[PDB]
Amino acid sequence: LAHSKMVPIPAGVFTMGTDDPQIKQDGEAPARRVTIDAFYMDAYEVSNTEFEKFVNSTGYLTEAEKFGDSFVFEGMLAPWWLPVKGANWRHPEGPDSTILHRPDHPVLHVSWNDAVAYCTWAGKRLPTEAEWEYSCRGGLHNRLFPWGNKLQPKGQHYANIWQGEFPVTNTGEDGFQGTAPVDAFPPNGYGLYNIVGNAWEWTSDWWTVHHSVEETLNPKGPPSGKDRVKKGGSYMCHRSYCYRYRCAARSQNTPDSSASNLGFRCAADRLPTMD
Ligand SMILES: *[C@@H]1O[C@H](CO)[C@@H](O[C@@H]2O[C@H](CO)[C@@H](O)[C@H](O)[C@H]2NC(C)=O)[C@H](O)[C@H]1NC(C)=O
Ligand SMILES: [Ca+2]
Numbered sequence: 709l710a711h712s713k714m715v716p717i718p719a720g721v722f723t724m725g726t727d728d729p730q731i732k733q734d735g736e737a738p739a740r741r742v743t744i745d746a747f748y749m750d751a752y753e754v755s756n757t758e759f760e761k762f763v764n765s766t767g768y769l770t771e772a773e774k775f776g777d778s779f780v781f782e783g784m785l786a787p788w789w790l791p792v793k794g795a796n797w798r799h800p801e802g803p804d805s806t807i808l809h810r811p812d813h814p815v816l817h818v819s820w821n822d823a824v825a826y827c828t829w830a831g832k833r834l835p836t837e838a839e840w841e842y843s844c845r846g847g848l849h850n851r852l853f854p855w856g857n858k859l860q861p862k863g864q865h866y867a868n869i870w871q872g873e874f875p876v877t878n879t880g881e882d883g884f885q886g887t888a889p890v891d892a893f894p895p896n897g898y899g900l901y902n903i904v905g906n907a908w909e910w911t912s913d914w915w916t917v918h919h920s921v922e923e924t925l926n927p928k929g930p931p932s933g934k935d936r937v938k939k940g941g942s943y944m945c946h947r948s949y950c951y952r953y954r955c956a957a958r959s960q961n962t963p964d965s966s967a968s969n970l971g972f973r974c975a976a977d978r979l980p981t982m983d
């Protein structure tokens with residue numbers, strides 16, 4: 709296993725957002741041209757095992773652990789998000805759950821601050837929204853998903869999202885009701901796994917829904933805000949209710965927030981030291 713490996717994301721120009729927004733309230737529009745310098749992106753969402761290395765090294769206590777609760781989806785115990793006492797990265801559904809059987813699944817119940825701590829410890833950083841979205845798109849232009857416009861190309865599942873009647877029944881058609889291992893499903897064109905679906909992913913940007921059409925270079929998002937941007941959707945998303953497993957999709961939470969469907973991956977300007 710090599711679940712902290714990074715891939716080189718090539719220098720390029722791409723179209724961020726879309727002039728055909730699917731959730732207009734989220735500021736998916738307008739489409740805008742963005743230039744990104746070459747950098748490195750984690751191939752995988754950060755796993756439980758990888759986060760445990762960080763915690764073993766630093767003693768870091770996550771915000772959910774300090775607060776004493778975190779949001780858990782009711783179906784695996786909005787009205788379906790319950791603040792559960794004792795839910796945190798080691799106990800994803802609450803005190804009597806465990807990660808012992810899921811070491812290679814994405815770490816969950818990590819806040820934006822927890823994510824920044826991990827990435828910086830690892831000699832890395834969070835990606836910007838634009839870096840994240842560019843990477844998500846995987847060298848394709850103006851497609852819904854990292855792989856194209858069809859949800860199930862060639863009749864194959866390409867991401868871990870919801871099948872069935874949300875939120876009452878998840879059929880597990882794609883092989884996973886909750887999270888999947890961080891190396892599940894096909895990679896996109898840049899070598900990234902689970903960039904849509906599985907766990908939501910934090911980015912460094914403050915959230916706004918107001919974007920200009922002006923061309924930008926390595927944009928960092930607005931200089932102020934109250935919520936940070938998250939991307940890519942999760943195992944909970946379904947076309948019928950929450951259609952956010954698209955590269956152009958976007959949502960937000962306060963930086964001290966955490967939940968059972970939200971994780972992260974890191975980026976870096978250069979290759980850090982490892983092993
Ligand atoms: C995090 O630290 C724990 C505690 O040291 C590690 O678990 C122990 O590892 C030692 C050495 O390999 C084993 O002999 C013990 O059986 C383990 N004890 C416990 C309490 O499980 C753990 O491997 C570390 N995690 C990571 C990802 O490196
Ligand atoms: Ca699924």
Ligand SMILES: [Ca+2]
Pocket residue numbers: 753902903904905906907908909940941
């Ligand atoms: Ca993901």
